[PDB]
Structures are given as C-alpha cells and as structure tokens.
Design a protein around this nucleic acid. Sequence first.
RNA 1: CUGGUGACUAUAGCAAGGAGGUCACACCUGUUCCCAUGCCGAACACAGAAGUUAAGCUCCUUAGCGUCGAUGGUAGUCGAACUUACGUUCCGCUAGAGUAGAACGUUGCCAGG
RNA 2: CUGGGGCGGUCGCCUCCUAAAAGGUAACGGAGGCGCUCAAAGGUUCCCUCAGAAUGGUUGGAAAUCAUUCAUAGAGUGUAAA
RNA 3: UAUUGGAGGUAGAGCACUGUUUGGAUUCAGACAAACUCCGAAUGCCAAUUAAUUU
Lengths: 173, 94, 77, 118, 47, 137, 70
Amino acid sequence: LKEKFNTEVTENLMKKFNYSSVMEVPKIDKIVVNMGVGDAVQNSKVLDNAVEELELITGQKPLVTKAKKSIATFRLREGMPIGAKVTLRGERMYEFLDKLISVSLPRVRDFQGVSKKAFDGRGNYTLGVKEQLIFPEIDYDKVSKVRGMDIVIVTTANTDEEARELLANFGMP
Amino acid sequence: ASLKSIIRQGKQTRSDLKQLRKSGKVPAVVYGYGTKNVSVKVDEVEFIKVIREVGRNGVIELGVGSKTIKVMVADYQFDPLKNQITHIDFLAIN
Amino acid sequence: STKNGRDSESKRLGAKRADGQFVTGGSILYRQRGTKIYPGENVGRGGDDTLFAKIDGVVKFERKGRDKKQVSVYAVA
Amino acid sequence: ISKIDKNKVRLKRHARVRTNLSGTAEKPRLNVYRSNKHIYAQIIDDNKGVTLAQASSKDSDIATTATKVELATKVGEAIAKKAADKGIKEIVFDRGGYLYHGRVKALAEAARESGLEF
Amino acid sequence: RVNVTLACTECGDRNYITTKNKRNNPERIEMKKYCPRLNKYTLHRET
Amino acid sequence: MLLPKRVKYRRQHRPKTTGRSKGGNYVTFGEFGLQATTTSWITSRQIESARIAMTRYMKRGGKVWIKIFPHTPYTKKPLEVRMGAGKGAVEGWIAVVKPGRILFEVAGVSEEVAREALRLASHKLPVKTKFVKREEL
Amino acid sequence: MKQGIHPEYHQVIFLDTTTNFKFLSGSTKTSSEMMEWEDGKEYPVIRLDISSDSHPFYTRVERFNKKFGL
RNA sequence: CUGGUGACUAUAGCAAGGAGGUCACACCUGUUCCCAUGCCGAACACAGAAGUUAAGCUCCUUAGCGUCGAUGGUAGUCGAACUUACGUUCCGCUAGAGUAGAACGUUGCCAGG
RNA sequence: CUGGGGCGGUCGCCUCCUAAAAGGUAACGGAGGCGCUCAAAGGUUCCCUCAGAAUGGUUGGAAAUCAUUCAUAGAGUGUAAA
RNA sequence: UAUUGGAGGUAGAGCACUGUUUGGAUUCAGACAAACUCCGAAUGCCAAUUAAUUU
C-alpha cells in the first residue's frame, strides 16, 4: 500500500538508479481527472451526470472548468463552462491509484494495458479510461453515455525511464 | 611585409584630409596591445603591393615613426564609385 | 469628392516649466497622455496624467531606471 | 514538477508594498522577517537608511521554548522598549510580504500595547 | 438608459441626479448618500 | 510585372532622390554586375525589358539576380482634369536608384559574354551605368 | 477539505476474492454484508471479483480434419 | 565571514561546470487549534524537529548569449561663399553601424561569528 | 465653402501622418472614429499573472477542456487611433 | 554672446518590433518604409549666471 511506497525506494529505485541521497527519489505528486467536453448546447444534463462520475470515482466535488477561448465556428466562447476537473494529492491520491491498479486490471479488455510509451519526457502517464474499470461503485445501471477519463499522474521524477521504474509497482506496461 | 608610414598631427581639418587623399596617401590608425593609438598616413601604391600577395589577412611589419610593429589589416574602408581606399585599420599583433 | 478632410483641434502638450526654474504650489509642470514622465518628490499626477508641483521650489528632471524618468521639486531656502 | 521558492514569491510581494514605505526619521518603518523558527524585527529610517533598533528571536533574552506565536509576542515587547529609549513613539508597520495573521498580529499587538503608536 | 433623480427618504426630496439602464435595473434604485439638510448620511430612493 | 502582393498605404509621398545610395553597393552573389552612376526611378516595366534582354543573350549560361525591387507606388490624375480634388489612383511601381547601387548580377559565364549581356540591359534603362567585378583586397 | 463540499466517503469494503485488499474507499454505500475486524471491509458492495486474479495482461485447417478424419 | 534591510543606466543578467551545511536558510513530519484552498493542508496559517545537502539558497572558476565601449574615419548638418547643378568649396559641431576592448558587480547601516 | 459657377463632396467634436526631435502650422492632402456604455466595467483591502510553441493524451473540428516544460511582453486593457 | 542644466525622436542610419522583399539550406547572406524604431545628430526652444557688451 502506501508503506510499500517507502519500501519501493530501496526495492529497486535505490539500487537501479544509484541515487546518493534518499531525498533524490521519485514520488507521485498529484493526479487529475479531466473528464471532457459535455457539449454546452444540449449537455446541461450531461456534465450534471458526468460530474457525478468523477465525484463517485473519487470523493471530492470536482471544479467545473470554463472554456477561456472564443473559438468561432463552434459553440464556444469566453465563458460557457464546458469542462470538469478534480485534483487528488494526499493519502486519498494514493487510494485512487491502488483502487485503479487493483480494480482496473482485468476490467480493461486490453492486454498491454493502456500504453507502453506514455512518458511525455516529463514524467506524466496521462492514461485513458473506459468508465467501467474505474468507478467500480458506479455500476452499469446509473447512466448511459460511456466516456473515457484522463488520469494524468504527475510524479516528481526527472526522466522518462524513472517513471517506468517508479510506476513498476502495480503497473502493467 | 615592408610598409613605412608617417605620423600625422592631431585635429586634421576636413580639407587637408581631402588634400592628401588627392595624392596617393590614405589615412590610417594603429591600435592593439603593445602600443597606443596613432594617427598614421600610409601610401596607396605601396600598400597595395605589400598587400598584393601577403594576403587579405597577413602580417605587415609597419614601421611607425622609428619603431617597426608587425600589424594586420583589421578592416578597410572603400569608395566603390571611385575605386579608392579611404582609410585602413592596423591591428598590432603580439 | 474625397473622404479625408477631418482632424481635431489638438492639445498644447509637453513641458510647461524648465529644469532649475522656481515654481509655486500648483504649477503644471508637464502635460501628457499616459506617463512619458512620472511624478517624483513633491509632484502629483492629475486625473488625465497631468504633472503638477505641490510645494514652492525648483524643478529637476532626472533618470528613474533603465529608460524611465521623473520630475521633482526641491525646497531651496 | 518544479518547486516554488517561498522567499522570492514574498520578496516580490514586498517591493510592491514598499511603494508607500516611509521611514522618515520621525516615523520609521517596523520591519519583520520569518524564516521557520525566527522572527526578526527591525526599525529603519528610509531617508538615510540606517537601523535604529533591532530585536530578534535568536537573542539570549528571548531564547525559550514556546509555540513561536506565544514567542513572537515576546519579540515585539523587546523592540518596543528599545524604541522607547530612542525617543521614538509613532511608527509605520510594513508586514514584510506576509499576511498579517498569526505570528505577526502577535508581534504587532505585542508592540502596540508597549506604547509604540501605529 | 435614462436619467434618474435621487430623493431623500426622510429629509424630503431631491439631492442628486444620476443615470441608469432600465433593462438592467428596472426597479427604483437605492443608495445611501449625504443629505445636507440633515447633515447626515441617509437613504435615497429614485423618484 | 514585379510588385508587392500587399501594401498598407498605396498613396504615398514620393521618394527623395538626392544623396548617395546606402545599400546594395557591392557585388555579393555573382561575379559581375551593373553599377549605377546616376539617379533615377526604375519603373518595373523597364526591369522586365532589361531582364529579358540580358537573359536571351546569355542563352542559359548562369543565372541573373535582380538586386532592385519596385516597392513604392505612384499615382496619376485622369488625363484632362482640373487641379486638386483629391489624389490620383495608382499607376505603377518604382524603385529609387542613386549613384553607387548594383542593379543586376550575372555568374557562370565569361567576362566577354558578361560585358555584352549587361550592355543590352543598360540600353533599356534611364540611368548611366558601368560594369564591375567583385571587390577584393 | 472543506465542510460539506466534498462527497461522503468511508473505508470501502474491498474484501473481494482477489486477496481481499480492502484498503480502498469510495462513496459506495449499501448493506454491510461482511464486516471484519482485521481490516475495514464491511459495508459497500465488494465481496469478490476477478480483477486482481486474472488480469488482461496477468491472467479452419483443424476444423476440416476434425469433421472428416485427416 | 554569514544573515536582515536600502542605494546603484545589467560592468550587476542568462548559461553551463563545481564545491557547501544544526549560530543559521531550506526542503521535511503532521492537521488537534488560529485561518485556508471558486475541487486539493499544493499554496496560505499553525503545531512540530525524525530524515537530507538531492533541490532552492550562498560561494568559486569560465567571455557561449546578452549588457557596456573608445580612438580613427565616415554619413547628416549650423554659418559663409560660389552657383542651378539630383550640386561644388570652406569652417565649426559631429553620428549610426563596426572594430580594440571593459566586464561572471560596487556600496551604506544593523545583528551575529 | 469651392483652382469661375454648377454636379458630386463638405460643415460640430476626437486620434494619427503631412509638421521641418519645444509649442503652434494650410490645401476639395493621406488614413480612421464619435453623438455612447457600465449598479460594476466605480471606491477599498487582500491574492494572482499572460498569448504562443512543443510533448501525450476518449473527445479531436490541424485547432474545446487536462498536465510538464521553454516562454520578457509577441496577451489583456468596454468602444478609433496615438 | 559665453558657460551650465533640461524637455523634445527630425536628418542620417539601422532591421530589435509591425509590414514589404532577393537568392541559398526555422536558419546563412542581401535590400525597402510619411503614418516602422534597438538607436540618434547639427540647429532651434525653455531656464540659470555671483558674466561681458547695448538699449
């Protein structure tokens, strides 16, 4: 669990990268749950329901993002709230990782997981979702529109490879 | 690499710099490390020959006054419409 | 005919007093738009960017930073 | 990820407050500075730039074990008396770049009852 | 966008003159301003 | 046939013609060039006469560089009209050559073909010209 | 965490068949089927699953011959 | 010497490289209390002192990038005198660019060592 | 009013260039605006900081929202320009 | 008139920004501008003198 994260340092990280200080070890800093669009023409009840998903997959009222660009040729402009986001940092940010690494394993229908090359050169997975693996308390009876989340697990790593070794615990790459 | 020159006095009026260019003379300065700035007047026809196959960037033993400091043409200043050199900078090399 | 006969009866902007000159308490020192020049000591800024003295003294234009400047007024005895 | 320095973020919140800084030698400014276990008062005259009276938390007279907020109130009492001996009675308080809360309302409420006017 | 007159609520009547947009403020406006007959801040209704 | 595809003001004042050229005084792309020893406006219809003329003579030897671009428009009033009811409409595009400027460039041919191809060119131009090689020393 | 803003949570009953790692949480609220004292896995919904047991990664010619004899 | 706080047109800055630590400064440990995040104790505030010099911070060499910069010479010009030329001549003032070069900061008050 | 008169265009106000580094300076010279708007888009006390470019990400309109990094100033400033 | 201090971006010149452009492989060279400026005069202008001369 969380204490296993302490044993993960000297597990391989303390010996693989050969860091001369315990403070120079990777760590998970935060996670984001950016949902999507919820087209703000007929989706005043879509985001009202999608907000219930991220609020159900994690215990926190996510802040609704307001589109800040006046994109013409589209139903968007300065204003018009068309997005939702929720941040998880503390011990709760560790639960939402174990509950995914231990519940989103078989309920993915994908052999290689989500991707093998997801390190953006800055230590951030930003994986996908199918709305069924995550939200295990959100059964397949409540809503209809199945959407794909976006979990960007920003870590304190300093290189693409270190995120691979650091994310080895409870990961299928 | 043998070009002997003359020292010109201070505060050259506008006319008498125009009188010596009418001859085969060209103003010039000598700066670098090893000797301070000097207002010098070298000759035209002797400068072209000395620079003829010494190269665009070669060493010229310029005898300033009574000394002889090896120098190099730093930059030149040209009149394309009259085909004349009007001023030359000599960089003293150590 | 044309489309181009217009203009405005514009403004006598600029410096109204000089550096080293003596001025009274409500004198206008500089008439601008924006701040080409900025208020220093004992001068204030009006509602349309006017710079005016606040005390009897002598005017001084000085440098403020890289490429700014201010005015001032001192209180010579 | 990148970390933000908490000193530079307040050293810029302070230059913007000292655009009404006036230690005029008849009404100087009372400075403050927090490190982590260290409240540092000071009183300066800005027309000349010289310190008139300094009292910190690391001095031997204020070397004790307290909450650092019950201890900060003993740092405003110290400098409040040294300011009394210098014939100064009215100051203008700049909060550094910090919020006036906790440590500093204690350092100011402790200095504002010791006679210093502000 | 109209013109409005602010009349005192106890000192009796007109003190100030302002403007308003009657599509954004369709009601009667309310503001505390200085009545100089009472020498005191009071409440002013639009006439 | 040359002109800028855009312009922010098409009614402009006219250029000053006294002084000496600032830029384009040496040959820097070819081996030979055509220098101007007189002041004038080159009008963008007489840059095509002179390009075609020296191009046809060389017969696909090297290439040419037109070192002048007609950047400024000029206006003209409609034939027989009285004086002063606004400014006239654009009538052509000009450059301004002062004594010193290099107008054309050639390379990849011989001096005996270069002196002759740039001689047909200068008879299509209203300036007094001169032949030059690349400066050195 | 503010008071009233965040949703209601609790240590979820993650005592599924895959080792019963009930160290999670969630807004899942239902009858407490199995409430153990070793780890809090009492209330919400979860008593078994095939998630951490058989993961997706960590879980013609023949027809012809079969039909005939070849 | 370290720190707090002002003054100076970056000669003071970016950049890369390397040292440093309980008198300090920081990461760091936590959310009961003061207060707090249009969601998150991340930030802000507070209560703390196990762990570290890795990072920030400070110190030390580097002239790659910026900033600074002559002298000499030119453009352009005030005045004069010739002239009607896309001008000449004389005198004074004199750029911009570009070179040689300067430079990896000077300095006041306070408190400690 | 007016390169005779007439047609067309013009009349009051604001910004720029012409305008010759103070200020002022004409033409039927060259370019644009105004005849309002805002109960906060005003006062004050705290806090905050940009457009864009890559990268990796269900949507993809190449271009919504999300995250990291380089961004000095290329955003924003109700409404023309300075 | 001499000295001293100021405000102000013109000539020239430069591409650092807004536009306009030629040839090579976002760069390496070359050009253009009343309404372009990283720069920037000579003069004129506003003042001080505890300076001379004349009205």
